[PDB]
Design a protein around this nucleic acid. Structure first.
Ligand SMILES: Nc1ccn([C@H]2C[C@H](O)[C@@H](COP(=O)(O)OP(=O)(O)OP(=O)(O)O)O2)c(=O)n1
Ligand SMILES: [Mn+2]
Ligand SMILES: [Mn+2]
Ligand code: NA
Ligand code: NA
Length: 327
DNA sequence: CATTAGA
DNA sequence: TCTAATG
């Protein structure tokens, strides 16, 4: 957790690099498994040879480990950190819609900067355009103060469209969090479940509402169950307008909500931990359900849930407020 | 791990 | 269709 800190961090740097710059998935995957075990390793690593004793640690990494233990740095790391081309990819990548792939392509074409991106808006598709347009706004955290204003809007229309809708702004926002990356709203309706062969309008309607009143300003992607967009708080009596925010609305079969909702509420750790517990408690929990575990190894049979309570109940735990869904 | 774009 | 990108 810290006794192995640099080791891990250098390794992660290295790893990341294979994966983005080059396309060395394997090396790339090499580094993480390594980086993952050296972390669990309960003691301070004094040499490569020692690390080496680890699973995943080959001759390759040991070596790096030495140079790093030996001198406060790593050449290859030093070299990569420097290099303009690789530098450039880590950056273009910043744009929503840009990934390694395009980053490499763009680069090899001479697009290294935001400016270049502009001059060639044409080489970019709609998602990336939007990403470019809102670059600045995209990196800015979401003040809960705002988070609450937004939620208030969204719930407001939803209802207005159909009173039957059930919406839940999930995430850290849900989890108390002072700020948040983007708004995730879970959506479900009663006339929509497992079987009940869709109702795409169900997603569309609201999406339509939100736009009608200007909360939604752009669409990264709209399907029949997931909508990825851009929203924004009405710029008041002027002097102050609101940064453009990433928003994801998702449709759900009412018969999956809480799991869903459970799930997204996280925290990643609360999850797994909650998930690990369902196992002893003779179950299984995943994004959509919770099935009783049968001795024969595995088993099935979807337990019926009417709230996040039902689930705790099931696995017989303490109902944890979102607030304390921390770990 | 799964959904939407795209070309 | 594959293949990219975000979650
Ligand atoms: O479980 C998934 O949701 P996000 O990726 O948005 O994660 P959080 O809601 O935990 O983060 P934040 O809202 O701060 O971006
Ligand atoms: Mn989020
Ligand atoms: Mn999200
Ligand atoms: Na080994
Ligand atoms: Na990006």
């Amino acid at each position: 957790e810290t006794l192995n800190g640099g080791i891990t961090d250098m390794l992660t740097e290295l790893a990341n690099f294979e994966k983005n710059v080059s396309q060395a998935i394997h090396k790339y995957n090499a580094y993480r498994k390594a980086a993952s075990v050296i972390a669990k390793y309960p003691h301070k690593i004094k040499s490569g040879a020692e690390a080496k004793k680890l699973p995943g640690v080959g001759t390759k990494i040991a070596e790096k480990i030495d140079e790093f233990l030996a001198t406060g740095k790593l050449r290859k790391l030093e070299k990569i950190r420097q290099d303009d081309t690789s530098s450039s990819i880590n950056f273009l990548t910043r744009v929503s819609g840009i990934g390694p792939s395009a980053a490499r392509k763009f680069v090899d074409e001479g697009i290294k900067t935001l400016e270049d991106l502009r001059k060639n808006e044409d080489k970019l598709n709609h998602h990336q355009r939007i990403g470019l347009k809102y670059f600045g706004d995209f990196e800015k955290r979401i003040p809960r103060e705002e988070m609450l204003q937004m939620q208030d809007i969204v719930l407001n229309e939803v209802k207005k469209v159909d009173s039957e809708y059930i919406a839940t702004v999930c995430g850290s926002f849900r989890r108390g969090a002072e700020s948040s990356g983007d708004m995730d709203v879970l959506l479900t309706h009663p006339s929509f479940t497992s079987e009940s062969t869709k109702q795409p309008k169900l997603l569309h309607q609201v999406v339509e509402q939100l736009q009608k009143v200007h909360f939604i300003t752009d669409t990264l992607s709209k399907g029949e169950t997931k909508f990825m967009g851009v929203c924004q708080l009405p710029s008041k009596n002027d002097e102050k307008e609101y940064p453009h925010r990433r928003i994801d609305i998702r449709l759900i079969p009412k018969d999956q909500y809480y799991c869903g909702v459970l799930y997204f509420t996280g925290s990643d750790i609360f999850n797994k931990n909650m998930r690990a517990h369902a196992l002893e408690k003779g179950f299984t929990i995943n994004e959509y359900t919770i099935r009783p575990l049968g001795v024969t190894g595995v088993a099935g049979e979807p337990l019926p849930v009417d709230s996040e309570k039902d689930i705790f109940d099931y696995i017989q735990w303490k109902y944890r407020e979102p607030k304390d869904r921390s770990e």
